[PDB]
Design a protein around this nucleic acid. Structure first.
Ligand code: MG
Ligand code: MG
Ligand code: MG
Ligand code: MG
Ligand code: MG
Ligand code: MG
Ligand code: MG
Ligand code: MG
Ligand code: MG
Ligand code: MG
Ligand code: MG
Ligand code: MG
Ligand code: MG
Ligand code: MG
Ligand code: MG
Ligand code: MG
Ligand code: MG
Ligand code: MG
Ligand code: MG
Ligand code: MG
Ligand code: MG
Ligand code: MG
Ligand code: MG
Ligand code: MG
Ligand code: MG
Ligand code: MG
Ligand code: MG
Ligand code: MG
Ligand code: MG
Ligand code: MG
Ligand code: MG
Ligand code: MG
Ligand code: MG
Ligand code: MG
Ligand code: MG
Ligand code: MG
Ligand code: MG
Ligand code: MG
Ligand code: MG
Ligand code: MG
Ligand code: MG
Ligand code: MG
Ligand code: MG
Ligand code: MG
Ligand code: MG
Ligand code: MG
Ligand code: MG
Ligand code: MG
Ligand code: MG
Ligand code: MG
Ligand code: MG
Ligand code: MG
Ligand code: MG
Ligand code: MG
Ligand code: MG
Ligand code: MG
Ligand code: MG
Ligand code: MG
Ligand code: MG
Ligand code: MG
Ligand code: MG
Ligand code: MG
Ligand code: MG
Ligand code: MG
Ligand code: MG
Lengths: 96, 64, 79
RNA sequence: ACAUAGCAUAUCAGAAGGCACACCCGGAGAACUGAAACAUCUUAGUACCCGGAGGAAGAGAAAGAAAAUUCGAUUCCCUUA
RNA sequence: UACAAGUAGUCAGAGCCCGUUAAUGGGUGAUGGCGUGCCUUUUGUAGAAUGAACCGGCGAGUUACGAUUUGAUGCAAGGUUAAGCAGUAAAUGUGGAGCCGUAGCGAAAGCGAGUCUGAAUAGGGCGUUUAGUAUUUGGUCGUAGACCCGAAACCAGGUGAU
RNA sequence: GAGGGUAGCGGAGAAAUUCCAAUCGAACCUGGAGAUAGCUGGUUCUCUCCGAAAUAGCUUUAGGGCUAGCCUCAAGUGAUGA
RNA sequence: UAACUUGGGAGUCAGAACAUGGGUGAUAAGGUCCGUGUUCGAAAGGGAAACAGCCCAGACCACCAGCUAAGGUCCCAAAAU
RNA sequence: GACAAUGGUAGGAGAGCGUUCUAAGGGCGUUGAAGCAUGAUCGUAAGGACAUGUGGAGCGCUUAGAAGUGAGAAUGCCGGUGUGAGUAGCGAAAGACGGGUGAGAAUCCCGUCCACCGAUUGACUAAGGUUUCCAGAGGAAGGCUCGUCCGCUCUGGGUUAGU
RNA sequence: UAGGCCCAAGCGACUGUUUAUCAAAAACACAGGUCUCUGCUAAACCGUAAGGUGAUGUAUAGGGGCUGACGCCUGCCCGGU
RNA sequence: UCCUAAGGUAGCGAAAUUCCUUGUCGGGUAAGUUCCGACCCGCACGAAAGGCGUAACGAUUUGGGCACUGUCUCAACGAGAGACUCGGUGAAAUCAUAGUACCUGUGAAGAUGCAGGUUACCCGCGACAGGACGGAAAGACCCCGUGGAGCUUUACUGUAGCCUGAUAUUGAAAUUCGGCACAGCUUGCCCUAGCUGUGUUGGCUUUCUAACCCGCACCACUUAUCGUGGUGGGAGACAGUGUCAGGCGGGCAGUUUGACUGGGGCGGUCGCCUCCUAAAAGGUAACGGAGGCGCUCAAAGGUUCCCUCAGAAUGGUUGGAAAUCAUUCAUAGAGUGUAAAGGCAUAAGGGAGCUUGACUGCGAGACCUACAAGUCGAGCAGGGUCGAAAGACGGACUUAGUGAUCCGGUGGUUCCGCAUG
C-alpha cells in the first residue's frame, strides 16, 4: 500500500501466459557425467540411482557445461548440440 | 497458515537469476499517437523492480 | 470577494552546466542544458535537438571564448 | 340409488416430550467488518432460527480418473501448492 | 519549634541526645547558600493543559502457522524427509512420496552456458565463469482480536402494554 | 376500577419526534462480538555505546500513509570524505 | 578523518525563537511564507533580576585545589570605593 | 604504560539484575524454612548478604531450560483506609408533671391535665404484602437520639362456614 | 371560608387536546366548507397467505387530501409538473 | 413598446409579514423605540398552505385606567424553623505532597509556590465570597474523522408493490381482416396500381361449455355465517396462479455527496508550459506578481542552391500619414505558427527545385529523479532522400499541446491450443 498513490503492481501491466503443455527437463552437464567409469552405459535409471538426477521432470537433457573426460554410451531424452558433439568426440555414443 | 502470493504482482513480474524482478513498462496500452517513436520503442524494453520498491513489496512475492 | 488570478508556474528544468571546465568526461556526457545556444558546441561537442551540449569523445571539458560576445565548450582527448 | 363423507366400537411397548450450549445431514439465512469511502466482491453459506437424526452421520461399488506397461467403490491423512 | 514567607529537599553548620554490620558512627537541627512535584502531551507546561485522595493486590508486543534476515550446528553437489508404522503421550527407528539446490534465458514453441530481442556472427537485457540445504536462538513482517482498555452504531433471535 | 387487545423493519398518537416499565430520530435482553476506532489514554527492571526528524515527492491527502532524506547494527570497498 | 556499497532494525512527515537575504502584511504582530546560520527541540552548567529559542559554554564519577569565558568587582553579592 | 572517548528525546545496538517453574549436581532446615520487621552492610546500577525479633515447615545455591517475569499514573478493576469533620443532616406537628419499672429512662408503662384530626389522623373493605397478628422473654444488630420499648431477636401460639 | 373592576388591540370562533419530567400556545382537534377516490369480494388498510378491519355498512355510504364556527367573499394563468 | 402560461382582482397593509425604521401624521403621557388611529414608496400581504370582518369564549399575547398595596423611596420591628451553644448520633462531593501573604514584574503572553521588594508572633470560633483560570459533566458552540444515526430528493444502485405482454393451466365453433409463396387475369424476364381462388401462416371479434372461479341460493355431514360434498344460478377459456419480459416505483433499502483554505462556509483553485519573486550553479514557499497550453503545419518537415530586414528621408497617378515603384541612409528596433524566456542576420528569418529521415532494428554514455515516468545522445546495421561532393536528414529555433492500469475493438503473428487433429 502506498497511501493512495496508485500502487506499483497496478500502474504496471500484466504480461504473458502459462503453457498448459510446458515441458521442463532434468539437466545433466558433461562435468557431472565425468563420474561414470569409461565404457559405462549412462541411462536415466543409472543417473537417478547414482544421484546425479533427483527429479526426472519431463526427461533427461544433457548439456555441455564443463569438459567430458570419459568415453560413455549416453541414453537420454534430449541432447544439446554441444553435449552430443562432446560425447561423440570423446569416443562415446549418444542415443535419444 | 501459509502466506498468500499477491496474484496481480505475480501476473506482472518474473524472478531473475540473482533474485531481481523483471517487470514490463507503463504507458504501453494506448494513446500511442501522443508518444514519440523513440519513447514507444524504448518503452518496449523491460526493466527491473527498483530497490526502493523492492523494500516495500518483496514479501508479496516470497513464493514467486 | 477576493481571489488571485495568479498562482501558476511550471516545473523548473535544471538547466545550466553539468560538467566543469577541466573535468574528464566520457563520450555522450551532457555538458550544458539550455534554451537556444547560450553556449555553442565546440570541438568534439554536439548540440541535441533541444540545444543540449554533449561530448562526442572521451576527454577534458574546456569552456572557451567564441569571438567577442559568444562562447563555446569543447572536449579534447587526453594525451 | 349403489356407496362415499361421516359416525361408533376394539387393538397397538405406534407417535408425542426431553437433551450433550459437542459432532452429522438438510431448510432458511444476516450484519458490523475488509475493500484504507462504496454498490460487484468480502465478512460467509459464518452467526442466529428451524427440521431430521446416528452413535457416528454423510459418501460409496464408475454413464469414474486419465492418456501408460494405465488405474479400478467410498471416506480420511500427507503432498501436489 | 510561638518575628516567621516554606514543591519541603539539598549542600554548609553550631548546640543537644545517643553509641553501630566500628565505619574518616547514629538521632535531632539554631542559622547560611541553592532550589516552581511526577506523568502525559507539546514549538514551549511550575503551569491556571491532562491524570492520580492514600495504601495494597490485579492490570498491556503473546502464541500458532507461513515469509525473510542474522547467529549456531550437521552434512555438502548435495541437503532433507511428510503422513504413516513401531515406541513409554518420549528420545528414536523406519518411511525418499514430496521440497530446496545442482542452469539460465524466453510471453511461448523452444534453445541452453547461454538465451531473448533483432534481417544481423551487430548492439543491448537477463545469465555463465559454485554452494547449498536441514533444524534452531534472535530481529522484522504476513494471516489470526495480534500490545491493552474505550465508542456512537449495525445485524439476529428472544422479553416487555402491571 | 376490574378483566383484556395492539410489540420494535413494530405498535399507539385531538400530532409534541409524542408514549411503549424513572433518558425513544427508533424499547429491553442475549448473541454475531474482542464490530470497527488512520482518534485519546495507558504500556511495568538497570546500566553501557550511538543517536534523529518535524523535509521532498505522491496520496478522497492534509494531526494518516508510502518511497526518498536524516538515526542505528553488521559485512564489504579502501582514501574514493572534510 | 572520513567516505561509499550491500543487508537487518528504526523513528520522523505539528516545529520555535534569534540573526540575516527576501515575498506578504502596514519597511504592523511573539504574524505569515521561502533562503542562510545558530540555539531550543533532544542541553545540564555561568551571564541576561526572574526568563526553552539571547551571550559564554557541551555535565563519565569524586575533591573544602588552580586558570579562564560571557559577564563583572560600593552593600545585597565573589572581585578595583 | 600511554592517550582518546563517554549531555541526550524518538529510535537502533550491547551487557546485565531480579521473579515463578523444570532438569541435573551439590546443600540448608523444629539446635527453627519461607514470609514479615529493624539495623550504622556490600556491589558501577537493577540489586546481594549478615545480625536480631517475629514466624512455625519448608527453602537456597550452581549450570542449563522455560515463561501468566518486574507498575506510579490507563476519569484503570477490586479491597481497605483517610480528608472534608465532630462538620451537613437526624424527613411537615405540643407537650407538662406525678407514680411505676429498671444496671441505666426526655424517649418504656400507668395516671391527670393540655393539645391535634374529626367528608376525618375515625369505622369498614377490594387489591397488594404474606405471619408483619397474639402471649411470654430479650436488647448484639435494625430504629436517623435513647430504649427497660418495637412492624426487630428468641420461644410458644393463633385463622373453625350448607347460607 | 366565598369575584377585583374597566377601556382598547393582535391571535384562535367556541367546550376540548398537547411536548409524563424546562414550551398549554397563536400549535392539534373541532362543528362547517371543498376536492378526490369508491357500484360492493367497494375503495382504503393489516397480513406471505389464509383470515380480517371497512361493515353485519352500500354513494344522504365508506377512505384519503386540504380548509377550519359564523358573515361577505374566494380574481387571473392549464406553458411547466 | 419588450416579454410571458398569465402578469396580483376585492379586501387588507410599517402587519405574528416593513430591512431602511424609533417611517410620517394624529391620540394618549410632564416625557411613549411599546400601544391605539390614520397614511401607503407592501425590502418581502392577498383570497380554502383561504382574504377580510366578527358577538361569545381564553391560567393566550399587548397597551392604557380606577382600586390597591413594603414592588419602590428606604427601610424598621415582631413571631416561628435553620444557623449559634450543650448532650446523642453522624454523612458528602473533593483531594499530587503541602509549613498555602501582598505588590510590581517574569513566564505557555492573567502566579500561594519564580524575581525584587513589601508585609506578617503560634492555635481556634462566627461570618463574606475576590482568587485558587474553584467542584460538578473527557464542550452540546466551532472544526476535524474517507465516525454514526434520523430525515429529503428530478444523487446512485436497488427493491415491496402495481401496470403491461408472451407462455403454461387451456377446450369447441363461426365470422371477418392481414403477412408470405404459387398460379390466373389485370391497368401503365420483370416493375407498378389492383382483383378471384389456391396453401399453409397469423390478428381482431363473437358464440359455446367441460376445465377454472363465485365473501350466490338451497341440501347433507351438523346443535356450525368455518370446511367439505351435492344441486341450481352466475361467470368462463376470461379471471386467478406459475415462469419469462418491459414500464412505473424515496412506498421502502444500502450508500455516495473531494481537497486546499491565515477557523469553516461562500468565492477562487486543482494537470502542463514561460517569466519574476529566487539572495550571479542547481533547487527553493505563500489564496505572492504576470501570462500561456489541452494545438498547428503535407509544409510551417528533409535537403540543395540562392537571398536579407523593420523604419525614415527624397521623388512618383488613381495613392491619402500609411498600398505598389526608385535611390540613399538604416545592425537589427523586422521576422522567427502559437505565452514568456533564452536564442537566431554565417541565420534558427526569406525564396525556389527536388523530396518524405514526420524511416526500421537499436543504442556507449549522460541529464533528471522517491517510484512510475521524463529528457539528451554519439555510434552501428538495414533500406532511402537531397547534394557534383564533403555531407545532412530518426519532424518543426528551443522549452507546453497531455492520462497509469484493468477491460474491450481492429490489424499482424515461423507463439500456445486442456486425449489427438
Ligand atoms: Mg496492446
Ligand atoms: Mg521556470
Ligand atoms: Mg526537436
Ligand atoms: Mg470499507
Ligand atoms: Mg476502512
Ligand atoms: Mg450412511
Ligand atoms: Mg523564635
Ligand atoms: Mg517532541
Ligand atoms: Mg498549544
Ligand atoms: Mg496552582
Ligand atoms: Mg486532553
Ligand atoms: Mg484528578
Ligand atoms: Mg494504586
Ligand atoms: Mg503481532
Ligand atoms: Mg393496561
Ligand atoms: Mg398523546
Ligand atoms: Mg419538530
Ligand atoms: Mg419513559
Ligand atoms: Mg464477527
Ligand atoms: Mg471492542
Ligand atoms: Mg553523542
Ligand atoms: Mg486518487
Ligand atoms: Mg512565528
Ligand atoms: Mg504559526
Ligand atoms: Mg529559517
Ligand atoms: Mg540551557
Ligand atoms: Mg539566575
Ligand atoms: Mg584568576
Ligand atoms: Mg564582596
Ligand atoms: Mg550517553
Ligand atoms: Mg561530554
Ligand atoms: Mg534493541
Ligand atoms: Mg505480568
Ligand atoms: Mg462542635
Ligand atoms: Mg466546614
Ligand atoms: Mg455550621
Ligand atoms: Mg445543625
Ligand atoms: Mg421526625
Ligand atoms: Mg405485635
Ligand atoms: Mg440506638
Ligand atoms: Mg382556542
Ligand atoms: Mg414538560
Ligand atoms: Mg408547563
Ligand atoms: Mg389551518
Ligand atoms: Mg384560488
Ligand atoms: Mg407605529
Ligand atoms: Mg400568506
Ligand atoms: Mg390557496
Ligand atoms: Mg385560517
Ligand atoms: Mg379551554
Ligand atoms: Mg433554632
Ligand atoms: Mg453533638
Ligand atoms: Mg498538576
Ligand atoms: Mg511576558
Ligand atoms: Mg518571593
Ligand atoms: Mg471549573
Ligand atoms: Mg472533549
Ligand atoms: Mg434513503
Ligand atoms: Mg454497511
Ligand atoms: Mg477541508
Ligand atoms: Mg486568523
Ligand atoms: Mg545563489
Ligand atoms: Mg538559480
Ligand atoms: Mg519556424
Ligand atoms: Mg486439443
Amino acid at each position: 500500500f502506498e497511501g493512495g498513490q496508485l500502487p506499483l503492481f497496478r500502474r504496471l501491466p500484466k504480461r504473458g501466459f502459462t503453457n498448459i503443455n510446458r515441458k521442463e527437463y532434468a539437466i545433466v552437464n558433461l562435468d557431472q557425467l565425468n563420474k561414470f567409469e569409461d565404457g559405462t552405459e549412462v541411462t536415466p535409471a543409472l543417473l537417478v540411482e547414482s544421484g546425479v538426477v533427483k527429479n526426472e521432470k519431463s526427461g533427461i537433457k544433457i548439456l555441455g557445461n564443463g569438459s567430458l573426460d570419459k568415453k560413455l554410451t549416453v541414453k537420454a531424452h534430449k541432447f544439446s548440440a554441444s553435449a552430443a558433439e562432446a560425447i561423440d568426440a570423446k569416443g562415446g555414443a549418444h542415443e535419444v | 497458515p501459509k502466506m498468500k502470493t499477491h496474484r496481480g504482482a505475480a501476473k506482472r513480474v518474473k524472478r531473475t537469476a540473482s533474485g531481481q524482478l523483471k517487470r514490463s513498462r507503463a504507458f504501453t496500452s494506448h494513446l500511442f499517437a501522443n508518444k514519440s517513436t523513440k519513447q514507444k520503442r524504448q518503452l518496449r524494453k523491460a526493466r527491473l523492480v527498483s530497490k526502493s520498491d523492492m523494500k516495500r513489496v518483496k514479501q508479496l512475492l516470497a513464493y514467486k | 470577494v477576493s481571489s488571485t488570478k495568479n498562482g501558476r508556474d511550471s516545473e523548473s528544468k535544471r538547466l545550466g552546466a553539468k560538467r566543469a571546465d577541466g573535468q574528464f568526461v566520457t563520450g555522450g556526457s551532457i555538458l550544458y542544458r539550455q534554451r537556444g545556444t547560450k553556449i555553442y558546441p565546440g570541438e568534439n561537442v554536439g548540440r541535441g535537438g533541444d540545444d543540449t551540449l554533449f561530448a562526442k569523445i572521451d576527454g577534458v571539458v574546456k569552456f572557451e571564448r567564441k569571438g567577442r560576445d559568444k562562447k563555446q565548450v569543447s572536449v579534447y582527448a587526453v594525451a
